[PDB]
Amino acid sequence: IQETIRKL
Amino acid sequence: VKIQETIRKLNR
Amino acid sequence: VKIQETIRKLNR
Amino acid sequence: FRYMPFSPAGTPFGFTDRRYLTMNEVGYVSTVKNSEQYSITVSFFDVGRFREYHFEDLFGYDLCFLNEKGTLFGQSKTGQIQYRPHDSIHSNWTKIIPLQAGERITSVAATPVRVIVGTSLGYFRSFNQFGVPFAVEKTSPIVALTAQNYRVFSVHYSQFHGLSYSLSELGTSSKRYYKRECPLPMSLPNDANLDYYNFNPMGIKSLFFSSYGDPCIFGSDNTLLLLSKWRSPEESKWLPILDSNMEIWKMSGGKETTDIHVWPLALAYDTLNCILVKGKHIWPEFPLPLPSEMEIRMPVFVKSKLLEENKEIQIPVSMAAEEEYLRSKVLSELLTDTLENDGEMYGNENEVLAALNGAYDKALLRLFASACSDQNVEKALSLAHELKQDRALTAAVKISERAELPSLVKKINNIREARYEQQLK
Amino acid sequence: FRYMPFSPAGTPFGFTDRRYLTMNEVGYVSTVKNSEQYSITVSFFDVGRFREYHFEDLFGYDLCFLNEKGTLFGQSKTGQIQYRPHDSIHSNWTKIIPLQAGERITSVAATPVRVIVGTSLGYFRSFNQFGVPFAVEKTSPIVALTAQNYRVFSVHYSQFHGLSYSLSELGTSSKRYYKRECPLPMSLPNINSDMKKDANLDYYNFNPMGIKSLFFSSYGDPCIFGSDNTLLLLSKWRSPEESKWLPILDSNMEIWKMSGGKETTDIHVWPLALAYDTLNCILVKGKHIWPEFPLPLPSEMEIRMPVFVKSKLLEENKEIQIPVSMAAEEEYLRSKVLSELLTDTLENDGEMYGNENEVLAALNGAYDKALLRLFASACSDQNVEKALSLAHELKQDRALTAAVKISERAELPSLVKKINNIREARYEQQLK
Amino acid sequence: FRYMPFSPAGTPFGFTDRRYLTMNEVGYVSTVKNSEQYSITVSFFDVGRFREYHFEDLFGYDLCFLNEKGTLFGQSKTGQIQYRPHDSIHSNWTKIIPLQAGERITSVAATPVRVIVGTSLGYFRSFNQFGVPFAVEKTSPIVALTAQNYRVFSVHYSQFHGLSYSLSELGTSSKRYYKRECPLPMSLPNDANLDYYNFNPMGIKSLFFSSYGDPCIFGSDNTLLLLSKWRSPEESKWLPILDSNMEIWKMSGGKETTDIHVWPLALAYDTLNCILVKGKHIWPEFPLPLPSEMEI
């Protein structure tokens, strides 16, 4: 989930 | 059956 | 009995 | 908010000098403005049993409740009540209820063994049929009261919870609550009938125990609500069992009327003894018509679907069997609870429940046949699980054989075998 | 809604610089504004037992509760409490109650063995007499607390359920509920637009609920005294399905009877405690409904069942003379209620003072004696049915014999035979 | 107050011609305005387990519920419902609910064994997975419904004390209430997202049972509330076990991102299956991104 917020 | 007759009389 | 006397005095 | 004096099936004066105080299956009590006093008339439907009489009211009674043994009257403002037994053997007695500043008597009720008075401050004063007080209780503000034998159905109101109800039993020892201020999901009113809703703000046209001892209420939404499973507090449900507006619609040939209304008196098993009112107003007039009998119907009928089948309102057998299944299931479940805890009260409950369970399976087997007609094996098996009598399970097997569904036959026989193996334990 | 710091029988400052924190049968706790601090004075009615003392309050205590062994103080805003035992054996201890954003302590209570603190968020923090904390509980927002020995009577409020009450016991391990958040049918105040200049508006701003006081009775039954000046006692609280709130005293009606039927606008009752059948109170004369300084001596008002009608009392008088026929109905009802409560008390808790069995004995005696007066008036009016129903409610068999002799004197032989049937039926049920 | 048709994790039309009916851990159901009718599409997240399908909606359903066995549809005004099992072995069935004057279906729900319909007047009509009616019950006006096995979690609205919740088991014996219209401690709603709060005035984004049998609710305050110890009415407590506002802030380095929003699907023991929305609108649009999991 930490990678999803980074790309957003 | 008596109520259906009563509403039919009261209907029109 | 004492309370009825007190109320009589407070009205008076 | 202003509490109004309530009585079962009471009517307002309107533009007349007379109205009905109370009204139920026993008779009707009317009052007529007489210059400065009132003329109260107590009438009965079974004219053979009791004799209609009348007396002069020097107090202005606006509260009344009628049972088979006597009549109870009450004054909402002065707090004076009077119990007049129907027979002349027993004497009339009169008491005056203490009322505080702005306290009004909102409802009264009486049984052959109890007399109940409820106030707007929440005072619950109970007496025996002779005027001997038992105990004074403080509850929520009471708006409606009805009673049967030793049990009381009270409707309360506040600014917080809204409308709540309590169900209690006034035993010989002490008072016991079955339900204490639980939610009452009766629809509140939302005009030509403005005179009525000022006389009855809640719209409670009447409330009463059923003939078998189940609490009922009839709000302004003209829907008969029965309290199911009130002996088990965690299973209590209010069940809509009659949409009187829908019935009049079905008997009137699908025509929307604005002149036919229902006035509830009591519920006898499956029949709603009522008064059919014709006119602009929703409350009955003088003279009072003869009581009518409306069979209860589960609100499962759709107007649009009924119009298509007719092209009196003809009901499709597939839909009428589904309604008969629900109606039997509800009535059977209630009457069984009655016989398992309180026993009998009229002498025909055991025979009624027997024929009731029969109509349950018969209507349920009709649905099972239509499921086999549509090759719906899954829906048919679920229907078979709900069957009561083992003879009905055998009948379902033969229906499956005529429909040539051998896969269904084997699964139903598993149910028959499982019930036969529970019989061995 | 805004929760206010509550204490039993507390009075507001009003337009003065002093008020009463709490007040009951033991004594009274007052506080005076002293420039920037406060001067708290703890006084007692039994001057022989305890010695009146006073101390300087640098915190501004607005919460207090008094028992026979110590005094509890509390600050609604900072969350600081202090328990000061009367005796020098144990030292005073002070704790600070955790309070969240806007959380206020709404009521405090203390017994010789328990200390209870209630907040506006519904936190129920309990301790022993030394400050050892118990489990912390989350309930409905608390507005009023009272306790007696190991039992707690709590009043909760919400915008949903309204006014509820809980009755619990603080055991050695954890808290056990006799009743949890049942309806509390106490009458709420009715404030008008002319009350915005009324002299007693300050009280209902200081106590919105109108709970003038609440307490356990001398025999351990919960009581409450709302703004309607009616003493409500909780009957059958050990059996949940039988719980009843019984109005046992209309103090406004009593004052009306003591004043000779004249409506007064200057006499009010301030409740302290209930001793068996007597309400210890303070008779306040003046414009305000709460006592001011100096405090009068406590008065004693016997409880009377609200069955008296003003109109009937005025006609019978033409002190307020009460007709014996109507007074016997009240004495029957009152005895029935008191007997029923004391019987439940002795069957579960035993005795607590040593003479309860003697009290219940004379209580049941006055029950039948007053009930026989109703039976006599029924026979005087030839009402055989009403008399027979009255006889069924008789307790002692020796009371049934008295009813037989009364029926013989009234020349009602049919009734005599029916009363003796009760004796036979009661002998039959005793053997089966 | 306006009784708006509710479904778990539903999205409004906005200015587009398509929206989502319902949405949970099983999948997402969307409907598109056509020339005259609608086009409903039922998709799944485990594409290797359920067959996606679509049909033409001649009735214009605005209510939906999705379980692991079928999809329940509903029309709030005509009172028409329809259950479509995921497997073609079971037949689709259709039934019309009786609705009085101004009575609207507000919420529907389904399990493998039960089908629930609730109205704005307080009617509680329950059926089995084949349409056979079991009981018609009158309660407070219903605004939100969800179910699991035999349990049912209903949100009611009263004119007086406002929102309330009920919890009950529809066992084969008889319906048993654990909680009966108790207070709902949810935060009511306080603009670009004004289209949503008209489609859902009560701000209940979604509600469901946890994988261990506890009711959950996700308000406009974006806090997952959990009802713990509901079998014991004395110890019943609502626990805010997840504040999605904090978790987004902590994973953005510490910068207040106003383009990130959470859309709840379900609660699988330890993780919150949800949809992370990027845009000015707090509701997800098309195409639907991959489901995320937020720890508790």
Author numbering:
A (entry chain F): 504 to 511
B (entry chain D), C (entry chain E): 502 to 513
D (entry chain A): 474 to 663, 671 to 791, 814 to 927
E (entry chain B): 474 to 791, 814 to 927
F (entry chain C): 474 to 663, 671 to 776
Study text:
Ctf4 forms a homotrimer that has the potential to connect the CMG helicase to one or two Pol α complexes, via the α-helical bundle at the carboxyl terminus of each Ctf4 protomer, which binds to a short conserved motif in the GINS component of CMG and the Pol1 catalytic subunit of Pol α (Simon et al., 2014). Here, we identify new Ctf4 partners in addition to Pol α and helicase, all of which contain a “Ctf4-interacting-peptide” or CIP-box. Crystallographic analysis classifies CIP-boxes into two related groups that target different sites on Ctf4. In addition to its role as a bridge between the CMG helicase and Pol α, our data indicate that Ctf4 functions as a key hub within the replisome, linking the helicase to a diverse set of partners.
Multiple hits of two more new partners of Ctf4 461–927 were also identified in the screen, namely the Dpb2 subunit of Pol ε (Araki et al., 1991) and the rDNA-associated protein Tof2 (Huang et al., 2006, Park and Sternglanz, 1999). As Tof2 had not previously been shown to interact with components of the chromosome replication machinery, we expressed a tagged form of Tof2 in budding yeast cells and found that Tof2 co-purified with Ctf4 in both G1-phase and S phase. This is consistent with direct association of Tof2 with Ctf4, and we confirmed by native mass spectrometry and pull-down assays that a peptide containing the Tof2 CIP-box could indeed bind directly to Ctf4 in vitro. To establish how the divergent Tof2 CIP-box binds to Ctf4, we soaked the corresponding peptide into Ctf4CTD crystals. Remarkably, the peptide bound to a different site to that recognized by the “type I” CIP-boxes of Dna2, Sld5, and Pol1, namely to the side of the C-terminal blade in the β-propeller domain of Ctf4CTD. To validate these findings, we used the crystal structure to generate the ctf4-3E allele, by glutamate mutation of three key hydrophobic residues at the interface between Ctf4 and the Tof2 CIP-box. Critically, the ctf4-3E mutations abolished interaction with full-length Tof2 in the yeast two-hybrid assay, without affecting interaction with Dna2 and Pol1. Conversely, Ctf4-4E (with mutated binding site for type I CIP-boxes) was still able to interact with both Tof2 and Dpb2, despite being unable to interact with Dna2 and Pol1. These findings indicate that both Tof2 and Dpb2 are archetypal “type II CIP-box proteins”, with a distinct binding site on Ctf4 to the type I CIP-boxes of factors such as Dna2, Pol1, and Sld5. However, we found that the size of chromosome 12 was strikingly reduced in both tof2-4A and tof2Δ cells, indicating that tethering of Tof2 to Ctf4 is important during chromosome replication for the preservation of rDNA copy number.
